[PDB]
Amino acid sequence: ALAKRIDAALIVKDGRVVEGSNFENLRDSGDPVELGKFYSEIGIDELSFWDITAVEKRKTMLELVEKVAEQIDIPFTVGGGIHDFETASELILRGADKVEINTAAVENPSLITQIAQTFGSQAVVVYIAAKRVDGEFMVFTYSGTKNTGILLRDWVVEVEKRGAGEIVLGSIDRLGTKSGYDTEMIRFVRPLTTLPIIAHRGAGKMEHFLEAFLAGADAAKADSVFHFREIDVRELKEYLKKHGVNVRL
DSSP: OOOBEEEEEEEEETTEETTOOSOTTSSOTTOHHHHHHHHHHHTOOEEEEEEOOOOOHHHHHHHHHHHHHHHOOSOEEEESSOOSHHHHHHHHHTTOSEEEESHHHHHOTHHHHHHHHHHOGGGEEEEEEEEEETTEEEEEETTTTEEEEEEHHHHHHHHHHHTOSEEEEEEGGGTTOOSOOOHHHHHHHGGGOOSOEEEESOOOSTHHHHHHHHTTOSEEEESHHHHTTSSOHHHHHHHHHHTTOOBOO
Protein backbone atom coordinates (compact mmCIF):
# COMPACT_ATOMS: atom_id res chain seq x y z
CA ALA A 1 0.00 0.00 0.00
CA LEU A 2 0.27 3.54 0.02
CA ALA A 3 0.56 4.83 3.48
CA LYS A 4 -2.16 7.20 4.72
CA ARG A 5 -0.69 10.47 6.09
CA ILE A 6 -1.37 12.59 9.10
CA ASP A 7 -0.47 16.41 8.42
CA ALA A 8 -0.19 19.13 11.21
CA ALA A 9 -1.22 22.60 9.91
CA LEU A 10 0.39 25.66 11.65
CA ILE A 11 -0.89 29.20 11.12
CA VAL A 12 1.99 31.63 11.55
CA LYS A 13 2.37 35.46 11.55
CA ASP A 14 5.63 37.39 12.16
CA GLY A 15 7.39 33.97 12.93
CA ARG A 16 4.94 33.06 15.70
CA VAL A 17 2.30 30.24 15.83
CA VAL A 18 -0.99 32.22 15.82
CA GLU A 19 -2.62 30.92 19.06
CA GLY A 20 0.36 28.84 20.13
CA SER A 21 0.05 25.33 21.52
CA ASN A 22 -0.17 23.50 24.89
CA PHE A 23 3.16 21.75 24.52
CA GLU A 24 4.72 23.45 27.57
CA ASN A 25 7.59 20.83 27.44
CA LEU A 26 8.82 23.06 24.60
CA ARG A 27 11.10 26.01 25.04
CA ASP A 28 8.69 28.24 23.15
CA SER A 29 5.35 26.47 22.54
CA GLY A 30 4.60 29.30 20.05
CA ASP A 31 7.79 28.77 17.99
CA PRO A 32 6.72 27.13 14.64
CA VAL A 33 10.13 25.65 14.02
CA GLU A 34 10.38 23.93 17.49
CA LEU A 35 6.66 22.90 17.40
CA GLY A 36 7.10 21.59 13.76
CA LYS A 37 10.16 19.69 14.85
CA PHE A 38 8.44 18.27 17.86
CA TYR A 39 5.44 17.05 15.76
CA SER A 40 7.93 15.30 13.40
CA GLU A 41 9.36 13.41 16.32
CA ILE A 42 6.07 12.17 17.75
CA GLY A 43 4.62 10.86 14.52
CA ILE A 44 3.26 13.64 12.22
CA ASP A 45 4.06 12.66 8.58
CA GLU A 46 4.04 16.18 7.09
CA LEU A 47 3.74 19.76 8.14
CA SER A 48 1.94 22.65 6.70
CA PHE A 49 2.53 26.42 7.42
CA TRP A 50 0.18 29.11 6.50
CA ASP A 51 1.49 32.66 6.78
CA ILE A 52 -0.64 35.65 7.42
CA THR A 53 2.15 38.27 8.02
CA ALA A 54 1.41 41.86 6.76
CA VAL A 55 5.00 43.32 2.91
CA GLU A 56 6.88 42.11 5.88
CA LYS A 57 5.67 38.91 4.51
CA ARG A 58 8.31 37.83 2.00
CA LYS A 59 11.30 38.10 4.23
CA THR A 60 9.30 36.41 7.04
CA MET A 61 8.27 33.52 4.88
CA LEU A 62 11.83 33.09 3.50
CA GLU A 63 13.26 33.02 7.05
CA LEU A 64 10.65 30.38 8.05
CA VAL A 65 11.39 27.95 5.20
CA GLU A 66 15.14 28.39 5.82
CA LYS A 67 14.91 27.58 9.51
CA VAL A 68 12.48 24.62 8.86
CA ALA A 69 14.45 23.14 5.96
CA GLU A 70 17.46 23.09 8.21
CA GLN A 71 15.86 21.56 11.24
CA ILE A 72 13.08 19.17 10.30
CA ASP A 73 13.29 15.86 8.40
CA ILE A 74 9.74 15.48 7.16
CA PRO A 75 8.07 17.08 4.11
CA PHE A 76 6.50 20.57 4.57
CA THR A 77 4.37 22.95 2.61
CA VAL A 78 4.32 26.72 2.88
CA GLY A 79 1.31 29.07 1.95
CA GLY A 80 -0.15 31.76 1.30
CA GLY A 81 -0.37 35.17 -0.31
CA ILE A 82 1.96 33.40 -2.72
CA HIS A 83 0.47 35.18 -5.77
CA ASP A 84 3.14 34.71 -8.37
CA PHE A 85 5.71 32.30 -9.82
CA GLU A 86 8.65 34.33 -8.49
CA THR A 87 7.63 34.23 -4.85
CA ALA A 88 6.70 30.54 -5.16
CA SER A 89 10.00 29.75 -6.93
CA GLU A 90 12.02 31.50 -4.31
CA LEU A 91 10.39 29.76 -1.39
CA ILE A 92 11.01 26.40 -3.04
CA LEU A 93 14.27 27.91 -3.64
CA ARG A 94 15.01 28.35 -0.07
CA GLY A 95 14.02 24.85 1.02
CA ALA A 96 10.21 24.41 0.98
CA ASP A 97 9.19 21.04 -0.40
CA LYS A 98 5.85 22.40 -1.59
CA VAL A 99 3.94 25.58 -1.98
CA GLU A 100 0.28 25.83 -1.32
CA ILE A 101 -1.95 28.16 -3.27
CA ASN A 102 -5.68 28.77 -2.96
CA THR A 103 -7.08 32.18 -4.00
CA ALA A 104 -3.94 32.67 -6.25
CA ALA A 105 -4.65 29.40 -8.06
CA VAL A 106 -8.23 30.32 -8.74
CA GLU A 107 -7.34 33.82 -9.92
CA ASN A 108 -4.33 32.67 -11.85
CA PRO A 109 -4.68 28.86 -12.66
CA SER A 110 -1.60 29.21 -15.00
CA LEU A 111 0.34 29.67 -11.80
CA ILE A 112 -0.17 25.98 -11.04
CA THR A 113 1.32 25.08 -14.46
CA GLN A 114 4.35 27.31 -14.04
CA ILE A 115 5.50 26.00 -10.75
CA ALA A 116 4.67 22.43 -11.86
CA GLN A 117 6.81 22.58 -14.98
CA THR A 118 9.84 24.17 -13.34
CA PHE A 119 9.77 22.21 -10.00
CA GLY A 120 7.50 19.28 -10.75
CA SER A 121 3.90 18.60 -9.82
CA GLN A 122 5.09 17.29 -6.43
CA ALA A 123 5.94 20.83 -5.44
CA VAL A 124 2.40 22.24 -5.92
CA VAL A 125 -0.61 21.88 -3.53
CA VAL A 126 -3.86 23.55 -4.27
CA TYR A 127 -6.13 24.14 -1.28
CA ILE A 128 -9.80 23.88 -2.50
CA ALA A 129 -12.25 25.57 0.05
CA ALA A 130 -15.73 24.40 -0.85
CA LYS A 131 -19.26 24.84 0.46
CA ARG A 132 -22.75 23.49 -0.48
CA VAL A 133 -24.70 26.29 -2.22
CA ASP A 134 -28.20 25.33 -3.36
CA GLY A 135 -27.42 21.62 -3.44
CA GLU A 136 -24.14 22.21 -5.33
CA PHE A 137 -20.51 22.13 -4.21
CA MET A 138 -19.03 25.51 -5.07
CA VAL A 139 -15.44 26.76 -4.79
CA PHE A 140 -14.79 29.82 -2.47
CA THR A 141 -11.82 32.21 -2.25
CA TYR A 142 -10.70 34.75 0.39
CA SER A 143 -10.83 32.39 3.23
CA GLY A 144 -14.14 30.85 2.32
CA THR A 145 -15.98 34.15 1.85
CA LYS A 146 -16.20 34.68 -1.88
CA ASN A 147 -18.36 32.40 -4.00
CA THR A 148 -16.36 32.04 -7.25
CA GLY A 149 -19.28 30.47 -9.06
CA ILE A 150 -17.02 27.51 -10.04
CA LEU A 151 -18.29 24.01 -9.41
CA LEU A 152 -16.01 21.86 -7.19
CA ARG A 153 -16.36 19.07 -9.69
CA ASP A 154 -14.90 21.29 -12.45
CA TRP A 155 -12.08 22.95 -10.47
CA VAL A 156 -10.86 19.54 -9.22
CA VAL A 157 -10.49 18.40 -12.85
CA GLU A 158 -8.85 21.62 -13.95
CA VAL A 159 -6.48 21.74 -11.00
CA GLU A 160 -5.27 18.21 -11.94
CA LYS A 161 -4.93 19.09 -15.65
CA ARG A 162 -2.84 22.16 -14.88
CA GLY A 163 -0.41 19.97 -13.07
CA ALA A 164 -1.03 20.28 -9.30
CA GLY A 165 0.46 17.40 -7.37
CA GLU A 166 -2.03 17.29 -4.49
CA ILE A 167 -5.30 18.78 -3.35
CA VAL A 168 -6.41 19.96 0.15
CA LEU A 169 -10.15 19.63 0.38
CA GLY A 170 -11.41 21.93 3.07
CA SER A 171 -15.13 22.01 4.00
CA ILE A 172 -15.90 25.63 4.85
CA ASP A 173 -19.05 24.53 6.77
CA ARG A 174 -16.87 22.45 9.10
CA LEU A 175 -14.57 25.28 10.02
CA GLY A 176 -14.38 25.31 13.73
CA THR A 177 -16.88 22.46 14.14
CA LYS A 178 -15.50 19.27 15.82
CA SER A 179 -18.02 16.72 14.48
CA GLY A 180 -16.09 15.03 11.66
CA TYR A 181 -14.54 15.67 8.29
CA ASP A 182 -16.94 16.32 5.42
CA THR A 183 -16.81 12.70 4.20
CA GLU A 184 -19.63 13.21 1.70
CA MET A 185 -17.49 15.94 0.03
CA ILE A 186 -14.45 13.63 0.11
CA ARG A 187 -16.53 10.83 -1.46
CA PHE A 188 -17.93 13.22 -4.11
CA VAL A 189 -14.36 14.29 -5.19
CA ARG A 190 -12.71 10.87 -4.94
CA PRO A 191 -13.75 9.39 -8.35
CA LEU A 192 -13.09 12.71 -10.15
CA THR A 193 -9.31 12.79 -9.62
CA THR A 194 -6.44 10.50 -9.11
CA LEU A 195 -4.52 13.15 -7.30
CA PRO A 196 -3.83 12.68 -3.56
CA ILE A 197 -6.61 14.16 -1.44
CA ILE A 198 -5.88 15.80 1.94
CA ALA A 199 -9.05 16.25 4.07
CA HIS A 200 -9.26 19.39 6.21
CA ARG A 201 -11.85 20.95 8.65
CA GLY A 202 -14.03 19.14 11.17
CA ALA A 203 -11.75 16.68 13.09
CA GLY A 204 -12.70 16.30 16.78
CA LYS A 205 -11.83 12.81 17.61
CA MET A 206 -9.68 9.89 16.36
CA GLU A 207 -12.63 8.12 14.73
CA HIS A 208 -13.05 11.18 12.41
CA PHE A 209 -9.75 10.28 10.76
CA LEU A 210 -10.76 6.66 10.19
CA GLU A 211 -13.94 8.00 8.55
CA ALA A 212 -12.05 10.38 6.22
CA PHE A 213 -9.77 7.51 5.18
CA LEU A 214 -12.79 5.29 4.47
CA ALA A 215 -14.06 8.18 2.36
CA GLY A 216 -10.97 7.93 0.13
CA ALA A 217 -8.71 10.57 1.58
CA ASP A 218 -5.00 9.99 1.17
CA ALA A 219 -4.14 12.28 4.09
CA ALA A 220 -5.96 14.04 6.89
CA LYS A 221 -4.74 17.60 7.98
CA ALA A 222 -5.63 19.00 11.43
CA ASP A 223 -4.29 21.84 13.52
CA SER A 224 -6.05 23.03 16.74
CA VAL A 225 -7.03 19.50 17.69
CA PHE A 226 -3.33 18.75 17.78
CA HIS A 227 -1.97 22.09 19.18
CA PHE A 228 -4.45 22.07 22.13
CA ARG A 229 -3.85 18.45 22.83
CA GLU A 230 -7.44 17.24 22.22
CA ILE A 231 -5.88 14.37 20.26
CA ASP A 232 -2.63 12.78 20.88
CA VAL A 233 -0.80 12.04 17.65
CA ARG A 234 0.72 8.74 18.75
CA GLU A 235 -2.58 7.54 20.07
CA LEU A 236 -4.26 8.60 16.76
CA LYS A 237 -1.74 6.47 14.75
CA GLU A 238 -2.13 3.44 16.99
CA TYR A 239 -5.88 3.67 16.74
CA LEU A 240 -5.75 3.95 12.86
CA LYS A 241 -3.31 1.08 12.57
CA LYS A 242 -5.48 -1.09 14.85
CA HIS A 243 -8.51 -0.58 12.65
CA GLY A 244 -6.65 -1.47 9.49
CA VAL A 245 -5.43 1.93 8.24
CA ASN A 246 -1.94 1.80 6.67
CA VAL A 247 -0.19 4.45 8.73
CA ARG A 248 3.34 5.18 9.64
CA LEU A 249 4.22 3.84 13.03
